[model samples]
Target chain A: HMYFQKARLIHAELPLLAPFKTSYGELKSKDFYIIELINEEGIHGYGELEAFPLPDYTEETLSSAILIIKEQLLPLLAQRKIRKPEEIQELFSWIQGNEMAKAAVELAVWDAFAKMEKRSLAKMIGATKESIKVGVSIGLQQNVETLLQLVNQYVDQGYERVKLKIAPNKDIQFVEAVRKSFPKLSLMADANSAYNREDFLLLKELDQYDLEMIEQPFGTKDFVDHAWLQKQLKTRICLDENIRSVKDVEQAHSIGSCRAINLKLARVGGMSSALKIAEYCALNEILVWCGGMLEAGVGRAHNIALAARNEFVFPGDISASNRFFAEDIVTPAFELNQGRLKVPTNEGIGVTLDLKVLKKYTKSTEEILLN
Target chain B: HMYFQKARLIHAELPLLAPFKTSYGELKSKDFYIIELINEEGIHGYGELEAFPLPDYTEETLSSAILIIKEQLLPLLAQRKIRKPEEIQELFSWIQGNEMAKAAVELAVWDAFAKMEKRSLAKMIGATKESIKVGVSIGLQQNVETLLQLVNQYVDQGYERVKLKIAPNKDIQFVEAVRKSFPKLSLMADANSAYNREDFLLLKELDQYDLEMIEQPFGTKDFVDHAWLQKQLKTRICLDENIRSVKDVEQAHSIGSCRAINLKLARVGGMSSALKIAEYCALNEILVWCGGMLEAGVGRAHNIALAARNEFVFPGDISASNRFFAEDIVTPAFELNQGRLKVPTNEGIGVTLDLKVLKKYTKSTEEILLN
Candidate 1:
């Protein structure tokens, strides 16, 4: 067991290379927090908060999560002894929701634990792959032309799959244009739960495009509706917002809500919860892939490690660091290799913070000392 | 439609009449927020935030909700012209989760709109009842005798039903004792999602007690397991945490996960969302009842108005004001009569805030101007 002596919360802002528009809204920049846990062995492990400034993706927002981590969760940790990374979830399980905040702290502890044990996070977490196929999620573009142009760019960059961010009126036209332009690009559409039951016919229309899957077309609670739509459409539904935990995955699978899962580490809590979901998906024959939340370097690294698991049949929403940020906070920025990104083999997350760059982006920092 | 020129967020602390213990934890006092919307005509409508200091009942906590309401949701309202209380849901639909915050603001708007139209909130929301049967939820006690004593007291008070908050080891013995003592009591047990699938045997043992239902025997995402359990147990399943919106209620019903719904207006978003759920429950033959969040008088009154609807077939967890609070923030404190409480017939929520008491309880206050 790794014991942490201190913790720090870093609030930082990083501008998106371009405005990433989805059904929810546009994201020009992300303001998030980074949780750092310093172990008794003099090692530092990091985790990134995936919640946005607005609660567009999950119920948790940046400020809301900060308040929870500081006021509620930290006290729980301070009051107890954490035996392992997995213990964080059980210890803080009494505090409902705030999964993103819980994930941030848990991830940091996991990273620190792996580093202290002299192993990589992927290896420690039972990942079976050296590299994971990657994908790029294109935001809703101005027109089919702009959409196709971006698709062509990512195709040239060797992205294994291309997912178009779609909504009500923006659905079919863009998918058709992209499919027509790139005849055999591994394609998909993510609605971010933008479409309702009323838009069922429109969503079904995408079946003609032969896309890889349609992601979270209905709201989180619309598992039955998703099931109904999945029964009608040839296209497999891959739920993102709907699958928060392994139990949800089981619920979705049992209900036939979708054929696939878009797993996000922070959304499910952290590595321990992610591992359980991965285990369940592997056993249940449920198609699984990692989804990004416009995370900075620390979270991106964690996603890569998580995606390296064997059950991740499809390419993940993992792109080059430069694809989102001009200069990332971690050293040796991640670059696409062939159609995949190699899993980090070094201790912990296999990347150190670029102190100068991180300091430049950090808005505020606060530390908690344990005696 | 009501045009609000100003909005106020009031943070107040109210001491509970007694420490209320649940499976998650114990509560001695509740620190909450009351949202007040001021119309152009100078009438005030109020809504109380149902979130607790902790996120035991739901993922949303009081501080977490406060941040979202003050930072994210209020801006969405300010950026638009609300046509009606229903419009609040659509305008802030882009913001994910934080239903309590959204409901707090939306309820205030609904109260204001009903007052502006010179009608009761219940009438405006399509509720058909003048009085509704009320029930009491007894918190987990130290001993079976203590539990029996509380249940007997509520029965004597003419509460139509009695619900005992339960956990794993605390389950069967208490129910058996309570049943033996009060054989004719309308008894139910709310697990609050404390038990896992492995505890099915123990939960199945609950069937012998002739409970009205078992409320949320498993976690929120365990709709499938809940269905599995529902199929196995003779007792009906009543979902509280699982049914967040009408979509969820539909999901639960279609999946056979639950036979009854514990509808909390704030949990579903607001009056607009609650009314929709009530409509669906009425049409689908799904049992519906209102649940409480230990809210002050403002929210208690809203629950009363909501329970007045024809769809709420079961007695709700709505007790006299003194059941939870010693000195409520509103006037003519809610007192029980013949196992029923009369729905407020006057405009808005039909209860005026006691300024002297409210002021004494107020911890902090912030105002937002529309102009």
Candidate 2:
């Protein structure tokens, strides 16, 4: 078997809303580049590059990853030979930096290989891609007006469900605002690990809103608190960041930290790992929903496919593509018509990019220099 | 204060010697991409997109993340008015595909913002970027012959100490091989969650190896087994994969899982979370080292900077960049001259990209399309 023969970074500038604000404050609008990978077979994969100012969470940034890939990882790959995903995983098992880039390339290779083999990514992984029900997610903006507008839009557009982004300060106000406006809308709240175990009392106030689930009310790493919170809250607790890997998923389940899991393919590792988590959860009769990373076409397609294969995806967060991009690089872009997007029946990820569009956004490239 | 301005994803390819093997062989790879991020002000960050065919570890793929960013994240940013890292983090807090990608973008933005403000990432978080030491990590490859060669190379290259990647079958032979070759080499062993409580007897044998530490010899989630192993083995024990968050680190410490820790910036949720863990470890007098995820330049830079700040990084695995990349997308590429690479003294991550080189290896561009 042959391994990745070639790989490169592609850049495209994307326009953004000027001076955006969340519950925190205002943000400046700027152009961003979409990062992607191409395998030896000339197959491509995609991912986003988000570079925020605070290192609040992980140690990753666009510039640093670019340097690491060009300077460190790519050179190492050039020196060796890899024929399978397993091989690639092992090669970097002891190395450091750009795990996301490695994953993107690895996924692209797999997608390309699957496409070359003329197989559906779902079928390749022993799952099917038919119709993955999805939900739309709303953010906690500076005011409830924008949140309400986004919520109504998603509901009007026919999203199966809507999840409101919540912060410690806006938890009750935002939930109540949405609840009062759209009583029938299936709603959920995500605190993004904003609260602590002691905040359970404050969260109890949300019981009147009748949220479908409350996600990551506490930090992801606080399994003990999560378990404690689970006992305190009436709303179903869904674990997001807490589900770092398959093992974490299992532990979360065993500890009763969550009633349902928001399965993000990237969080757990990849599609394979996500499925493993689903299976484990399925065995325990825990509900699973394909979550979102605000992905572009390639990732959304994969998520839709994954969600379609499961019956427990009562409501999904994989909603309209319009929420993120102004001009997508891929052709036949994903759209939320009516309230749901259709799943692709074609093999692999079932989407391809318009190279012409890519060229318009190209930035810089670097070589994989080795010792 | 400006929050997040913009972000980009940089791509690169890597090859391996064979089908990469690991505890989760399903996601192992032979060839893969390194996902790098850059912020609006040009501060770079890095992440490893380690997508596996198996959904058990992660569902994030290069293609999926690219697509999501282009389609969902970018457009949302374009259409909405949000800027700060906190805002960006919250905006997509509920949307999920690959948290790693989100983390990559988030960290990149943080780096860029820090750079724009002319401050060190640590200082931005009320800490300073101080010079710290790092350890060297050895993989489970080749027979003892190759092991000897690898260990000698690291030691000659100025590694303060080395850790051997051990497995159940190759444990004793590999250790003895490296031990015999470099008798003075401060040695450690990482089983990568390959063993169980029943395997403690095998670990006891390592007591004679004069090993400095033993890591995750059992499963990461199996705290019971780890506790059991800690009591059975007289050698000092440490952990990596098991410590997913600050709380997990605390849990391991409480249970006597290990006296030390190996912190991967990505796994621990970037600089903020990692620093918190470092502080906690400091309080407990628990030994710590900045571990590797086969990260690229951005992550490596962060790790190196992080290691510089701490005194407990006895012997880190931060080593040559040649292990991963073929070409670095950054300017002033981080390289190991002589036995050590100099930590950047410039603001933020202290790096820039070589756009000309990046374009040469550009792959594909994916965008989000809203209907």
Candidate 3:
């Protein structure tokens, strides 16, 4: 059992290359925070925040996540010897929801656990993939022309799959426009729980496009409607916001709500929970993709590690690091190499932080001694 | 449907009459926070924090409770129109635990809702009792003689029942000393989860004292063991911390954890949840008493309102305002009359805030705009 020398929660607002508009809302920049678990042995484990500036993907936003970490989650963990990363969930039985907050700490602990055991984060989690297939998630652009141009650029850059963000009016016609532009493209539309059963006619039209999946066709709480919609669709339904926990995945699977899942560590607590859902998915023969938010480099690194899990059969939404940021806070800004991204092979989450960049961007940081 | 004009979270540290020593620990003063819900119709309802300074009773405190309300609950509620207090549980489904934190806001909302409906909080919740039986709970004293003397005064003051806080060395003999002196005084002992099954023979001896019930004899997590111990005791075992939700009551009931429950508003989410547990207890014919956390006047008012339910057969721990604070923050400080506390008939919880005293005691105040 290894404990940390210190736990530092660093807050920063990182500006994106451009605004990423979705069903949630438009996010110009994200309020990002990093959980750094620094051991006395000089090894540091890092976890990133995928929570948005607003309560879009989750009930958790940046400030609330940080508040819970400082006030609730960290106190229970700071000085304790976790023994293994698996103990994270057991320790957090007292708290509910705030998976993003829990994942921030839990994933860092996992990375540190792997570092202590002298293995890569992927190796520690028993990830099998050497390189995960890369997918580019294009945000809802200003116009259809701009969106098509963005898709063309991603395709030319050799992304294996293309995910387009769509809202109510921005959906069917928008998807059809993209499909018409790239007939053989491995495409999917993430509605972000925008449409409902009433949009059946519009969603049914997407069947002709031959999409990889129709991601989150209904509201997050509309799982019952998701099943009803799924029954009428030929294209696979993918659950994202609807599946926050392992129990949620089981319910979706049992109800035949979706054929695939978008596994976000923050959405499902952390890697441990993601694995639990992934295992269930594998057993049930459902496909999964390690999804992404408009996140920072550290989160992309975490996503890279998650993408190594065998259950993730499709190209994940982990775009190139430089895709979101002009100059990321992490070294060697992750870029796709011929439609593939290598799983880290070094100790912990294998990405080196640019201290100057992080310090420059950081608004504040508070340290808690784990002694 | 009734909506709120504002929700205010007020924080203060109130000095107790004396040190409160229990199985948890000793506290010279209580860290108190009150949730003030101001309705659109110009009426306000008040709720108080029962969580101790630390995670003594539950894993929530003044800081965490305030943070959740300010950051999560209030933001979701503030300007929102709530149909009934019961609908709040649905809004809170997104949140997992932090029942104490939720309760602080929920109880306040219930107060506001009652006021908006122009009925007493007790009347709105279908409570029929005009006056609830009162109980005087004595803490561990400096000496056995001192404790007995304290009990004598309370009994003489006309408290219907007297519950003594008993610890290891202070338990058996402490209880026997009281029984030996008074013989019969509607006496009971609250262990605050001090005893375990290993002390079986020691606890078995309490049966001879003709105690009303042995309160929380085991740990909150020791449900199976609690049921095991309850089976052997002639005095019905009462659970306090063990039952946080209606599900806990169900689980405990299924396992026969206790014959009686100490229904705490903070321990269970709020008035709605407390009502759920009380209803279950009523249907099962299990005895319940609205328990106390040595709360301020606002919270004591809430306990009095909860006590209006017919299922609450036993004298609740709604000690008078003078029992704790020298000058409470509420006007018309709750006073017991001949061992009975009448339910408030006026709107809200029927207590007006002593603004001068409130400002004097308030360490900090955070204002949040719902609009």
Using DockQ as the measure, the top candidate is 1
For each candidate in turn, the TM-score is: 0.93, 0.58, 0.67
lDDT of model 1, residue A336 = 81
Which stretches in model 2 have alpha-carbon errors above 4 Å?
A1-5, A17-57, A71-97, A119-129, A141-150, A180-184, A207-210, A311-314, A365-371, B1-198, B204-216, B219-225, B231-236, B240-249, B254-256, B259-371
Determine which window of 10 residues in candidate 1 chain B has minimal summed lDDT. B75-84
lDDT of each: 0.84, 0.62, 0.79
| TM-score of predicted structure 3, chain A | 0.94
Off by over 4 Å in 1: A126-130, A141-149, A166-184, A196-210, B126-130, B140-150, B166-184, B198-210
Interface RMSD of each: 1.4, 10.9, 8.1
Instruction: Order the numbered candidates by TM-score, best leading.
Output: 1, 3, 2
Tell me the tens digit of each residue's lDDT in model 2 across B94-143. Answer: 45224544555556556656676787665564545344445666677867
Candidate number with greatest TM-score? 1
Pick by TM-score: 1 or 2, better one: 1
User: How high is the lDDT of residue B88 in model 2?
Assistant: 55
Best lDDT goes to which candidate?
A: 1
- The residue-by-residue lDDT of candidate 1 on B70-96, one tens digit each, is 888777666466677788888877776
Model 3 chain B, poorest ten-residue lDDT window? B53-62
Candidates, DockQ: 0.76, 0.05, 0.09
CAPRI rating of model 3: incorrect
